[PDB]
Amino acid sequence: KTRRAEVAGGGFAGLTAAIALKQNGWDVRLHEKSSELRAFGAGIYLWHNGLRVLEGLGALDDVLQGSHTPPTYETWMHNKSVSKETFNGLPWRIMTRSHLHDALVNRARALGVDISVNSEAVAADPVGRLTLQTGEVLEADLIVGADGVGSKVRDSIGFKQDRWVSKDGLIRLIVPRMKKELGHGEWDNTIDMWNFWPRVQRILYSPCNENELYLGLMAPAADPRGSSVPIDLEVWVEMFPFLEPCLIEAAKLKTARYDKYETTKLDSWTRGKVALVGDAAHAMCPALAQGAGCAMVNAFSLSQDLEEGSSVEDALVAWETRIRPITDRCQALSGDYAANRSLSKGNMFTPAALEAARYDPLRRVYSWPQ
Ligand SMILES: Cc1cc2nc3c(=O)[nH]c(=O)nc-3n(C[C@H](O)[C@H](O)[C@H](O)COP(=O)(O)OP(=O)(O)OC[C@H]3O[C@@H](n4cnc5c(N)ncnc54)[C@H](O)[C@@H]3O)c2cc1C
């Protein structure tokens, strides 16, 4: 009589879905294809919307402890400060990916979510079957495709898909803060350091806590030095000399990767008893820092709609209808910002830009008015 859910993917979306369902009394199994549970991407920003999901997951305290809210979100163009934004009190937070992942994993385990590593979903059936790489077929009342941008769950079913790949990427790293070595300045701030001259090179500077700094080093794919990993120390120091102590530490990271990314928009997110959440459904440009925030809101919202006393099929349809427009709008605006390099101007976290962030999934209203 206990409802059964199978979740494919052990990322932020899958873990969120698993915790939220388990909290509602579902028997939940989560499948992670990797040998271990781990989050990549170095660091991550969350906002009010994602912090509220964490609150609703009972995972907020572990996240806030050991993460950071900068005094301000500052933007530079060619080393000149062009804006400082604090979003009228809107809560936000920076942390390492592992920090967020660990909080979600610990909460999942505390609740008795069944987690299988080395377990890869290769197909899903709308009537409620999930097939693993081994050949094993699992039956369930709900199947969640939270398996990222190349979702086999999605592709095993076939969803009409708008796909785009970014030509340019970036290198994301965690390094020591080296705060004392940085000297005079406001080194607790987020600082988005844009340049187009003498070359296109940008650093998003993002403190995660008193010990760890998240750096995003962005240069065109066509730049053989700026895009190099391990980093070409000289060309980063040249344009960002005030960050030399941290860049010296970054140069030690021989695991650095130049990551490109893609965006995804689907004609829908559901088929029968199958729901797609996270990047598998709606991967977006990083400009508004809402990829995971939207993913978490969506996975959390899915659990909510499954409490209405409907069939799973109808609840899934109602879920997309209810919650998707917030993601569609955020994805679109983020895409525009990215295409137009809008963030380079500063002062671009407008009310419309902050729309996803303002959404409270717990009370289902918009908060922190701008
Ligand atoms: C450069 C960059 C910066 C970003 N910055 C932010 C930010 O600051 N704030 C924010 O909110 N978002 C940010 N995002 C977006 C955010 O990273 C993603 O939206 C988020 O990680 C999506 O999580 P997910 O669980 O949907 O997918 P993923 O994180 O891709 O996780 C899926 C998990 O899938 C497991 N898996 C894959 N295939 C299978 C399978 N077949 N079977 C079982 N398991 C499988 C994967 O191995 C992994 O464990 C950023 C994105 C990029 C590219």
Q: State this model's resolution in angstroms.
A: 1.9
Is 169 near ligand 1, meaning CB less than 6 Å away? no
Decide: 152 in ligand 1 pocket, CB within 6 A.
yes
Number of H-type helices and E-type strands within the chain: 11, 22
User: What does the DSSP assignment read for 257-287?
Assistant: -EE--EEEEES-SEETTEEE-THHHH---GG
Rounded distance, CA 54 to CA 258, Å? Answer: 30
Cα of 145 vs centre of ligand 1, distance in Å, is 12
Closest-lying ligand 1 atom to the alpha carbon of residue 47: 11
C-alpha distance from residue 145 to each of 18, 40, 142 (Å): 11, 19, 10
Tokens representing 150?
């190349």
CA dist., res. 310 & res. 261, Å (int)? 37
Domains of the chain: 1-39+97-166+262-370 (3.50.50.60), 40-96+167-261 (3.30.9.10)
* Other beta carbons within 10 Å of 257: 16
Contacts of 165 (CB under 8 A, 6+ apart): 260, 261, 262
- CA 50 to ligand 1 center in whole angstroms: 14
Write the DSSP string, 96-138: EHHHHHHHHHHHHHHTT-EEESS--EEEEETTTEEEETTS-EE
Cβ of 311 closer than 6 Å to ligand 1, yes or no, is: no
